[PDB]
């Protein structure tokens, strides 16, 4: 029953009542406990079109996290065009928790189970669903953490490379295990990855690239300018804002006790607003070992509009794209 529309969606999670940290405290009143039996209805002999970038469902998630982030991590100072603000800024406990969005009455959501689906046009095998699988909301530039992984092969998703400026996005078949650390110079930080995982991924990436763009010599190079967040890999890990050098990881042509590549990060009291234009000031750090093991699930890049070569450079900026990588194969329809 192909009939797309606009609605006001609602959240779902496994929030905890005793708890004091942010995410779940937002969840306890903004939504509902998970139903331990999510069912699926396969639709035999039906194929249907979709355009995987023009979606209100993304915007609602986008607006939710804004209305989440603004009220909970309350900064010390805020500023943009003729306007300055300062409130109380306590350090808070924090983590990412998996979320499902769900469908109101006279209406349901579907699943494009084409694991070889790119974005454009028809989904072959399809089913219907009450609510999506769990996703913890990852606020990150360049890289995609803790999200949804590929099952068959590593596939690429962008509007069209003919319109280059359309940010290109990636999701992977296997996960890269990363650990970041700041010990108890209290500003300078660092991050760690063991070479062999990173080297082969980009090899298998380059191999799927020489196909998508017919003919080439795949070269990887870093960012070229503009503000901090996008030029770096910027992210949150419990009560701060990480900003890490990404210069080494984009390293030219990749060709067909375990050694670790180590990246010089730093933290910032000062952050450029990701919702709109604006620059932000937060509480200084707390003492001790600051660590998170989290896994990379994909990546954002942009086709470099320069040279008869194959220069691919890190993306980011927008967070609507950050939402795109996991909700990809979950849709909007009327029962009629």
């Amino acid at each position: 029953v192909w009939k797309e529309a606009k609605t006001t969606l609602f959240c779902a999670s496994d929030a905890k009542a005793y708890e004091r940290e942010v995410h779940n405290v937002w969840a306890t009143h903004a939504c509902v406990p998970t139903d331990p039996n999510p069912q699926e209805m396969a639709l035999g002999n039906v194929t249907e079109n979709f355009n995987m970038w023009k979606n209100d469902m993304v915007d609602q998630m986008h607006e939710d996290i804004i209305s989440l982030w603004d009220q909970s991590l309350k900064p010390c100072v805020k500023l943009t065009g003729g306007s300055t603000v300062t409130q109380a800024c306590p350090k808070v406990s924090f983590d990412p928790i998996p979320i499902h969005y769900c469908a109101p009455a006279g209406y349901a959501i579907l699943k494009c189970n084409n694991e070889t689906f790119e974005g454009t046009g028809p989904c072959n095998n399809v089913s219907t669903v009450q609510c999506t699988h769990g996703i913890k909301p990852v606020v990150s530039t360049q890289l995609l953490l803790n999200g949804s992984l590929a099952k068959e092969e590593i596939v690429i998703r962008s509007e069209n490379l003919t319109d280059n400026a359309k940010t290109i996005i990636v999701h992977l078949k296997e996960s890269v295990e990363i650990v970041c650390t700041r010990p108890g110079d209290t500003r300078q930080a660092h991050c760690n990855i063991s070479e062999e995982k990173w080297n082969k991924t980009l090899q298998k990436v380059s191999k799927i690239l020489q196909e998508h763009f017919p003919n080439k010599a795949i070269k990887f190079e870093p960012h070229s300018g503009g503000d901090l967040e996008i030029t770096t890999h910027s992210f949150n890990c419990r009560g701060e804002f990480f900003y890490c050098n990404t210069t080494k990881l984009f390293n030219g042509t990749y060709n067909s006790s375990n050694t670790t590549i180590t990246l010089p990060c730093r933290i910032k009291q000062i952050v450029n607003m990701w919702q709109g234009v604006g620059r932000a000031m937060y509480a200084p750090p707390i003492k001790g070992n600051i660590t998170c093991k989290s896994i990379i699930t994909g990546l954002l890049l942009t086709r470099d509009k320069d040279s008869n070569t194959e220069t691919f450079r890190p993306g980011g900026g927008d967070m609507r794209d950050n939402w795109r990588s996991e909700l990809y194969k979950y849709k909007v329809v009327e029962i009629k």
Partner: antibody, heavy 117, light 110 residues
């Protein structure tokens, strides 16, 4: 109507210097890569140099490497080729050409550079 | 180091002619950034085929391009008097470089 106007051809003594200019109109000069191409009298064509739209990425051939220099001005919409330490084997008809992508539509009329004493 | 063409081929008016273009596993075998070009004696070259088989606007359909393993090929059907010229193929090589073919002189008989 797209054009490529070449100038600066003529005789140079061997070891001497010359600079070639290619003037462009009818399209956006930036957003497009550019190439120099020479043709020795009665011989096959050979690629000289590549420059990218913003610059920064410049590529050269070996029988020319270290002697020729590619530059562009994205305001005046001009391509420049500075040539030093010229030998007689370089005597050729020289062409500037616009890049589509990995292919090359639209060509200059050709300026002949002769290297002789 | 160079792309091998037959130096000369010869057919009649209306007939079809095939030019072969041979390189290495580092240029033609890997890539489809392949482009064919026409050169009458003493004029500027004109773009014919690009990306193996594609035609730009301004080029007669009688021309067609192809690729297999390590060899590119050009096909000109319905031969005319205008078609009498030198022909060259072009390829991207590993290391952002480009390389040109030896040249095929097409002679239209009768």
């Amino acid at each position: 109507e797209v054009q490529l106007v070449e100038s600066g051809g003529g005789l140079v003594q061997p070891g001497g210097s010359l600079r070639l200019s290619c003037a462009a109109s009818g399209f956006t000069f930036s957003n497009s890569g550019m190439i120099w191409v020479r043709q020795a009298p009665g011989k096959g064509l050979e690629w000289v140099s590549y420059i990218s739209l913003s610059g920064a990425n410049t590529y050269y051939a070996d029988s020319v490497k270290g002697r020729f220099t590619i530059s562009r001005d994205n305001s005046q919409n001009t391509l420049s080729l500075q040539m030093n330490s010229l030998r007689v084997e370089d005597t050729a008809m020289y062409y500037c050409a616009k890049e589509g992508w990995s292919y090359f539509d639209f060509w200059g009329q050709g300026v002949l550079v002769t290297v002789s004493g | 180091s160079a792309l091998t063409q037959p130096p000369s081929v010869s057919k009649s008016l209306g007939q079809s002619v095939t030019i072969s273009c041979t390189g290495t596993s580092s240029d033609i075998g890997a890539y489809t950034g392949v482009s064919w070009y026409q050169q009458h004696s003493g004029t500027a070259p004109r773009l014919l085929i690009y990306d193996v088989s594609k035609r730009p606007s301004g080029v007669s359909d009688r021309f067609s391009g192809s690729k297999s393993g390590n060899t590119a090929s050009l096909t000109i059907s319905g031969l005319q008097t205008d078609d009498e010229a030198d022909y060259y193929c072009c390829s991207y090589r590993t290391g952002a470089t480009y390389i040109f073919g030896t040249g095929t002189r097409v002679t239209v008989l009768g």
